[model samples]
Target: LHKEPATLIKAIDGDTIKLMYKGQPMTFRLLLVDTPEFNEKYGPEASAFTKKMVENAKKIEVEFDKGQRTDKYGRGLAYVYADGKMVNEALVRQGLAKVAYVYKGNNTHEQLLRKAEAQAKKEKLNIWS
Candidate 1:
């Protein structure tokens, strides 16, 4: 995986964010997690949660998977961290997102996230409920 330090510019939605990486603008898609679409149910809530999470953070970090770095849409696929905790996992744990789009060999957090998803499901929080 590749690591990059970045600052949050804005949250495009629940699973996508705009970042300033080394003075350049970049779009980073939260890896291994999928939230509702902007026009879908619970979409606005998910976006607001993500916005608040990153906006309140002092620093944000991004780690790209070993394989494909970007999707066809040109967004960088990565695991995002804010205030020392992984954002993707937090979203799932909070029931704001679910584990999705995992790359078999490229995913480093697959098991960890799957466990979180299971717990969230068991707890029936938000989306799960």
Candidate 2:
């Protein structure tokens, strides 16, 4: 069994969600990717896709990056894992999200995220359009 129990309560977008952890409401800033602007062409699809993913996930684990734990908007900045897969990276690989960088510390996930972004851009992912 895991150390914590989390549930997805809402999808903020393709790259963000509202969660319930330990009976408390928490916002999740999906790590390693950023979706299109809310008004962008692909935004609705990306967000809808994310909602679907969250709805189907049986479990979610939060993985915190180095020197950072939360985003500026008070949402937890962590990699979301579901069924043992990194959900954030999955979105980017599928061309639903982009990489949004915010220097928070000596976090290595940023580099990994950048790489994902490069590939997404190369493929003209959602936001790249």
Candidate 3:
């Protein structure tokens, strides 16, 4: 996995974003997290939350996992960092997303996401409420 510096260009949805990576534009899907669909209940809220998370970030970075680089949709799968924090973990911790789509043997942040989701559920935050 490699870490690349980026700047957020747009938040397409709760789990998808457009970024400028190495002076080139790229699309990224947040790895190990899933939020509501754009047309589903709480979807808009999730997107808005994600937008807030990255839009105001002082710095952003994307890191790939060990396996595949992109999904079927051609969007890069990555662990996103805003400032110094993992945005994927933050989304789960805040209940804006849930832990889903685990990639066997390549889950570097699986335990962390699971723990965050548990805390969010216990706290009844956002979608977990």
Candidate 4:
């Protein structure tokens, strides 16, 4: 399809989300950005922030990398964009997410995310506190 079909319904963590796309349940990985574990400090806040950003949103873009498809648990690992903005990178730049390079396709936005994370750290955002 020429237009991406995705809408974030909930955020499990800074790196994972529950989404509804084309009437099907789907999960997505916020590519290149990682946040604290569910139990870690600010973890809930990070997730909550993501949830707020995508609530009721329509029209999202998906960028598949070399390892495109669902993860082991059936969650898709791909970069997501909305309103022409990279949601993953935005999270890091906004201090709600941190740099995470767990997948081979991580290079897709690793550099940009690292820079954003660095800026966030410098500003003492979230976990940096």
Q: List the residue pairs that clash in candidate 4.
A: none
lDDT by residue for model 4 (1-129), tens:
133667767667767778776688788876667777769887787777666666635657677666656767787777777666777887887787777765775466677778888998899987776
Model 2 clash pairs are 34-98
Estimate the overall C-alpha local distance difference test score of candidate 2: 0.74
lDDT of 3 by residue, 1-129 (tens): 666799988889999999988798889999999999989877998899889989989989999898887899988889999887898999899898999999885589999999999999999998978
Model 4 spans with C-alpha error above 4 angstroms: 1-3
lDDT order of candidates, best first? Answer: 3, 1, 2, 4
Residues 107-127, candidate 1: write the lDDT tens digits.
899999999989989999889
Give candidate 1's TM-score: 0.94
Candidate 3 scores a C-alpha RMSD against the true structure in Å of: 1.2
Measured on C-alpha atoms, candidate 3 has an lDDT of 0.90
lDDT of each: 0.88, 0.74, 0.90, 0.72
